[PDB]
Design a protein around this ligand. Sequence first.
Ligand SMILES: C[C@@H]1O[C@@H](O[C@@H]2[C@@H](O)[C@@H](O)[C@@H](CO)O[C@H]2O)[C@H](O)[C@H](O)[C@H]1O
Lengths: 212, 203
Amino acid sequence: GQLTQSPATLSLSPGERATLSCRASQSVTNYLAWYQQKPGQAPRLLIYGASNRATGIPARFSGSGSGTDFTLTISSLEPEDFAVYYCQQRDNWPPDATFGQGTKVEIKRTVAAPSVFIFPPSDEQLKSGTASVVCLLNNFYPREAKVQWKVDNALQSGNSQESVTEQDSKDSTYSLSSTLTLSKADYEKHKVYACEVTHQGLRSPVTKSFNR
Amino acid sequence: LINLVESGGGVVQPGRSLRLSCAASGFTFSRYGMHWVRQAPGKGLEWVAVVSSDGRTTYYADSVKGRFTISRDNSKNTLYLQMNSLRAEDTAVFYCAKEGGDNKFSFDYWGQGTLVTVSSASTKGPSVFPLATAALGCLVKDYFPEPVTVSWNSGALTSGVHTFPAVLQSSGLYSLSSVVTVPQTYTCNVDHKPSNTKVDKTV
Ligand SMILES: C[C@@H]1O[C@@H](O[C@@H]2[C@@H](O)[C@@H](O)[C@@H](CO)O[C@H]2O)[C@H](O)[C@H](O)[C@H]1O
């Protein structure tokens, strides 16, 4: 009925031991299964019956547990083990399968503050009738980052969407884009547009702004 | 050897129907129960339904019963998912999975997945606007549906490029940003197949 995985994210380096776990809501009659999933691909069975390795699964993957607690262990992480892992449960009847909400194994690296950039709406877009303000957070680590939009000091809420890239293959950092959407008439009624960024690599928040 | 191949996904309006197929080879199809498992964007796995090894008994997730019906043809080695009264919440990648040989409560093989997009928006090419260490980029806005490819300087500029995942705006249209940091000319080559839209944008 309910499967809960923890932790939500695991930041390790290649060669380290990864330990993830699933807590079943009730006692489980049918020994859990584990799956590995990489971006854009189908899940692939790793562990079935709690301790058995599916066919073609290297020895470094191990599972154990019984009743309500199960653990998936990767004795030593290889570059290809950085992915998302799901645990799964299923009975004879009712037949529905239930899945854990997933644990992401991510690459550990040193702290790196983002360099911030703010882009005004292009005149081109303004003559289309719309206004998009963009705040870029470039090459930072760790993932956690906070973007706060302000228009003439008015906190903006509900009118921005952000997007984040996967860990860069070279430096292992993340990049995030935040777009503030406004009707252009709205955009034209204001002066100061600012994006304040909070991140562990920064000792004080950084704000990039421009005057219309 | 063992293999599952799906087809049938597509972009559809709400209220319409789609039918998913999953052809199996490499094992005796008639012996195992088969399931459909979906994964909405930015989400985890969410079981959808199953049909017994002999197509006689079916079971559904509550969000789909009365609309979706799962069935099979053991003489064709094909699993189906008839989807009716599709709603926006349904868009996701749908996978077919086989109950395992050693343990039937695990899924040992999965199809590559088939995309189901349900939206009342119609096909539209994007408008590309300029985004002007230093950074610059291109805002590839208001297009439908996915995907769009972005490259810089016909593919000759690659270091420092960050092409962000598309975001679904409240208008039903997608939007994405592609930027590049430079410590020369800069052009984003945007391609949106679904609508034959192509733009080389010099920033
Ligand atoms: C859909 C099907 O549902 C369950 O099948 C079992 C079956 O193995 C028998 O045990 C029957 C009849 O008494 O009970 C059913 O519950 C299992 O979940 C199968 O794996 C599914 O394919």
